[PDB]
Structures are given as C-alpha cells and as structure tokens.
Amino acid sequence: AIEVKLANMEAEINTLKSKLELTNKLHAFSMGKKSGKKFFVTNHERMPFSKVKALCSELRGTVAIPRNAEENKAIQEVAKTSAFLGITDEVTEGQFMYVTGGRLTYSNWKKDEPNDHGSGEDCVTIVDNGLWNDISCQASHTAVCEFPA
Amino acid sequence: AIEVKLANMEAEINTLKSKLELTNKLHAFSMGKKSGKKFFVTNHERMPFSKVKALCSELRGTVAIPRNAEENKAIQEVAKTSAFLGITDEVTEGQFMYVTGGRLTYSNWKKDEPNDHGSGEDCVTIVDNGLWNDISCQASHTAVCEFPA
Amino acid sequence: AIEVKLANMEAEINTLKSKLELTNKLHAFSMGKKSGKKFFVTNHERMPFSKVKALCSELRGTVAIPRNAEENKAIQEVAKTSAFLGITDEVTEGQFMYVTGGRLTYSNWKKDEPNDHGSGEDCVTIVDNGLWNDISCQASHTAVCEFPA
Ligand SMILES: CC(=O)N[C@@H]1[C@@H](O)[C@H](O)[C@@H](CO)O[C@@H]1O
Ligand SMILES: CC(=O)N[C@@H]1[C@@H](O)[C@H](O)[C@@H](CO)O[C@@H]1O
Ligand SMILES: CC(=O)N[C@@H]1[C@@H](O)[C@H](O)[C@@H](CO)O[C@@H]1O
Ligand SMILES: [Ca+2]
Ligand SMILES: [Ca+2]
Ligand SMILES: [Ca+2]
Ligand SMILES: [Ca+2]
Ligand SMILES: [Ca+2]
Ligand SMILES: [Ca+2]
Ligand SMILES: [Ca+2]
Ligand SMILES: [Ca+2]
Ligand SMILES: [Ca+2]
Ligand SMILES: [Cl-]
Ligand SMILES: [Cl-]
Ligand SMILES: [Cl-]
C-alpha cells in the first residue's frame, strides 16, 4: 500500500503539473500571446508606479519594458492610454535604468524629454503616440505587466 | 527514503497550490479585475434567472449584485445588455432581497419601477443607462457573475 | 504517522484537481463559451495551416470547425479576419474531410469555390461575410481553435 500510493501520488502530481502548464498556455493564447513574443497584459487600472511594480511582482511578471520599436508599439496597443514603463532614474537623476537592471538601450523619448519637470520626474510613461515622457512616480497611469516570450 | 519522498511531495503540492492561485490572479487581472474591487464577468449568454444562479454557483461565484453606484456601473459595462442581478422579492412583494441574504440597500430603479407588471415580476435586470427593472424570473437575460474583491 | 500524511496528501491533490477544473470552467466562461456549446479562441496570430494544427493540438483542441450556421457565425466573430478551418482535401483531392475525421457535411462556400486554384488548394479559410474559400495550406491565416462543448 504505502509505497504504491506514494508512487501513484507522484504520478498524480506530475499529471496536475502538466494540466496547469496547459491551462497557462491556453490562457496566454486567449490573452493574445504571439509565438516567440513576450506578452503584455493590463486590467486597465491606473495607479502609482510603486503599485504597478507590486502588482506585476505578485503576478510574477514585471512592469512593461519595450526593448525595441516593435515591443514599444505592442505596449502602446495594450495600454490604449498613458502607461508606466519599467524604467526610472530614481537611483541617479538623469540616468534611466530598467527596473530589471541596466542602462537603457532603446528609447523613444518625446522631444526635450526626459526633463525632470518641476518638482521632479523619475518615472516614465509611454503616451498615446508611442513616444515617452518622464513623469512623477506618484502620478496614476495604466498598469501594464510583462511576461516572457 | 519514504519520509523524505513524502516531505518532498508535500513541498511540490504547496508549490502547485501557489502556482494555481497565481493563475487565478493573472486571469482576473487580464479580464479587468481592479484592485480591491469585486470581479465581474460574463460569457454574454442570456438565460432564465434559475440558470444564471446555477451557473455562477457552479463557478463558485454568485449572480452580480451592485452594492453602490460604482459597482452598478462596473456591472453595466461588463454586461453591455439587460442582465439579471442577484436580487428578488419572491418572499415579500416589494421587499427585494439579495440572493446571498439581507435587505436591499442601494437601488437604481427606472421610472415606474418596480411595478411587478402583468402576472408578476420578482427578479431584477440592469438595463439601459444602468437603470433597474423588475422582470419575470422566467425571462432570459445576460448572465453576469461576481467574484470577491 | 506516515499513513495520516499520505491520506492528507490524497485530499490535497483531490482538492487541487477540483479547483483546477473550476479555474478551467471560469476561463472558458470568461472567453465566451455558451452552455452546451463548444467555444472558439484565437490569439489573432496568422500562420501556415500545419502550425495552427500543431498549436490547437497542443492545447487539446483542434482547428475551428463550423458544423452549422451558428458555429460559423461564432467563428467569424472570433476570427475578425480570414482564418483556417479544420477542413481539408489533402488526402483525396476534391473530398474535403474534417481534420478529426469524416466527410464534410455542412458547408458555406463562396460562389465558385472550392476550386483547387492554380498549383492547388487543399486547405480552407472562413473569409468575407463568413463564406469559405479553399486556399494553400502554406498560406498564413488566423489561428482559431475550438474546444469541446
Ligand atoms: C505633470 C505633467 O503632465 N507634466 C508634463 C511634463 O512631464 C512634460 O515634460 C512637460 C512638457 O512640456 O509637460 C508637462 O509639464
Ligand atoms: C413602463 C412599463 O410599463 N414598463 C413595463 C415593464 O415594467 C415590464 O417589466 C415590461 C415587461 O416586458 O413591460 C413594460 O416594459
Ligand atoms: C474566383 C477565383 O478564381 N478566385 C481565386 C480563389 O479561388 C483562390 O483561392 C485565390 C488564391 O490566391 O485566387 C483567386 O482569388
Ligand atoms: Ca530624481
Ligand atoms: Ca528624473
Ligand atoms: Ca517630463
Ligand atoms: Ca411577488
Ligand atoms: Ca415582485
Ligand atoms: Ca417591471
Ligand atoms: Ca490536392
Ligand atoms: Ca484541393
Ligand atoms: Ca479557392
Ligand atoms: Cl518622481
Ligand atoms: Cl418572477
Ligand atoms: Cl495546399
């Protein structure tokens, strides 16, 4: 009994793992995930950057980061409005970095941005043009999370 | 060996339970669930009130119930059309009750409603502009379920 | 006690199986599955027929197959653009069969189709007005999968 049931439960666990992997794939597919492409998702809620980071962290994803013009357009299409990107110059003013680490490679700044306007701006939002504007991390913008290709 | 295998499998099970919870969260997020807000969803199928209750119950949810102006609006946008709410006066005419218990608090009746028209109307549907109308529980309207915030 | 832990484990696994089934039901509901009806899903990605087949197959579904006017309409709504159907005359030219077996019964061909045009056309796409056109299996059209009622 004991050994047999233990061996059976190991097979039961492996079967359930396979089914959940399937459930995940089907949900990503219905969410619009394209083969070999990372996918972006939003609930259309607007909130402060700190809240977006916490939310995408819970979902085991990260705040959306466009690494090139294609991804940038992909994020623009998902958000539909101004949305925070996983980019900030919180650590050293003027030096934008990915929240996942590293200096910015690709960028699509609007003319004369980033300017750390007025009281200060350390976060970044992709606007209704695909272009970027640095903005207050405390302002509320659309939460867009990113998951691996 | 055995005690070790058992412990290791219990750990695998804990990991799977969290992963499933993650799946549920990402799904709700992708479908528009806002932070600290109930999750409203529909398959866009119209049916008798009896079936909507059976359906939502099978999904471990309940028929959508607007507790305030904001929730009523949220339900309105998810539904798009006439949909039953979890409210009926099948016990005492004029005394509408939530299917989950308790007397009606917030309401948003349309002019001349509730009128328990014709042979009687004990169910409630959210209609145009988010206004309410009592209707026969036998009539078919959109099924909208709610899940806790 | 080893046996007590084994029994709890069984209960944990069974509880997980039931929760996963609920998650699958809620996902299907959210993606529009109607009671007693199979449902269709798409990620809106265009690809060759062999790829769509492989993709749906991996998800334990099949390339969408309209069995009547209602399903044809549902598939048309989901696709939004030209999409492959699980129907082909690859095995015997002129005799269309469902990828899952059996001769084609219900059809919705555009006037003058199927015509195995040019070098040949063995696949089928639902196009404008929901009508059908036989096309090369090598062409890239929208991937739409169907899942059991
Ligand atoms: C709060 C807000 O929208 N601030 C923007 C600022 O980020 C931008 O750089 C500037 C450009 O003229 O326009 C506004 O001041
Ligand atoms: C203004 C008025 O009498 N409206 C009634 C409504 O109360 C009733 O629920 C419905 C039943 O189909 O018939 C009419 O629309
Ligand atoms: C009327 C006619 O011959 N139409 C053909 C169509 O059947 C074929 O599938 C397609 C392939 O590119 O080329 C034309 O559109
Ligand atoms: Ca700063
Ligand atoms: Ca700054
Ligand atoms: Ca700025
Ligand atoms: Ca009554
Ligand atoms: Ca009544
Ligand atoms: Ca009425
Ligand atoms: Ca042929
Ligand atoms: Ca052919
Ligand atoms: Ca043709
Ligand atoms: Cl800031
Ligand atoms: Cl009634
Ligand atoms: Cl072909």
Nearest to C2 among A2, A16, A28 (CB): A2
Whether residue B34 lies within 8 A of chain A, CB to CB, comes out as yes
Say if strands C123-126 and C132-135 run parallel, antiparallel, or are unpaired. Answer: antiparallel
Q: Which two tokens stand for residue A62?
A: 């990260």
* Residue closest by Cα to atom 9 of ligand 2: B135
CA angle B148/B129/C27 to nearest 5° reads 35
How is domain B1-149 classified at the CATH fold level?
Mannose-Binding Protein A; Chain A (3.10.100)
Chain breaks in chain A (C to N over 2.5 A) after: none
**A112 is annotated as contributing to ligand binding:** no
* Residue closest by Cα to atom 13 of ligand 2: B117
Judge whether A38 and A144 are in contact, CB under 8 Å.
Answer: no
CA distance C39 to C37: 6
* Residue closest by Cα to atom 12 of ligand 3: C135
Please work out whether the CB of residue B121 comes within 6 Å of at least one atom of ligand 2.
yes
CA distance C68 to C77: 14
Q: State the sign of the Cα–Cα–Cα–Cα dihedral A109, A113, A119, A120.
A: positive
Resolution of the solved structure (Å): 2.0
Nearest of B137, B28, B129 to residue A58 by alpha carbon: B28
Q: Which two tokens stand for residue B81?
A: 């059309």
CB contact under 8 A, A55 and B34: no
Cα B98 to middle of ligand 2, angstroms: 22
B109: Cβ contacts below 8 Å, ≥ 6 apart: B131, B132, B133
CB contact under 8 A, A35 and C58: no
3-state helix, strand and coil shares in percent for chain B, rounded to the nearest 5: 35, 30, 35
Which chains lie within 8 Å of chain B at 3 or more CB pairs, if any?
A: A, C
Coil, strand, or helix at residue A144?
strand
CA distance C91 to C49: 15
Q: Which atom of ligand 3 is nearest to the CA of C114?
A: 7
- Write down the residue that tokens 């061909």 correspond to: C109
Domain-wise residue ranges, chain B: 1-149
Burial class of residue A141 (count of CB atoms within 10 Å of its CB; 0-12, 13-18, 19+): buried
Whether residue C22 lies within 8 A of chain B, CB to CB, comes out as yes
Burial class of residue A11 (count of CB atoms within 10 Å of its CB; 0-12, 13-18, 19+): exposed
* Residue type (1 letter), C120: G
Whether residue C23 lies within 8 A of chain A, CB to CB, comes out as yes
Helical spans, DSSP H, in C2-137: 2-30, 49-58, 69-79
Q: Which two tokens stand for residue C59?
A: 């998800």
Minimal CA separation from B113 to chain C, in Å:
31
Please work out whether the CB of residue A18 comes within 6 Å of at least one atom of ligand 1.
no
CA distance A117 to A120: 5
Q: Could you tell me which residues are beta bridge partners of residue C48?
A: C140
Please work out whether the CB of residue B135 comes within 6 Å of at least one atom of ligand 2.
yes
Cα B135 to middle of ligand 8, angstroms: 8
CB contact under 8 A, A17 and B16: yes
> With left for phi above 0 and alpha for psi between -120 and 50, is residue A107 left, alpha or beta?
beta
Nearest of C43, C52, C136 to residue C88 by alpha carbon: C136
Q: Could you tell me which residues are beta bridge partners of residue A77?
A: none
Experimental approach was X-ray
Nearest to A6 among B5, B29, B32 (CB): B5
Closest ligand by atom to C128 CA: 3
DSSP labels, A34-99 = PTT--EEEEEEEEE-HHHHHHHHHHTT-EE---SSHHHHHHHHHHHSS-EEEEEE-SSSTT--EET
Cα A121 to middle of ligand 4, angstroms: 6
How many CB atoms within 10 Å of residue B11?
A: 10
Cα B65 to middle of ligand 7, angstroms: 20
Whether residue B59 lies within 8 A of chain C, CB to CB, comes out as yes
Q: Which two tokens stand for residue B95?
A: 């005394």
Minimal CA separation from C33 to chain B, in Å:
6
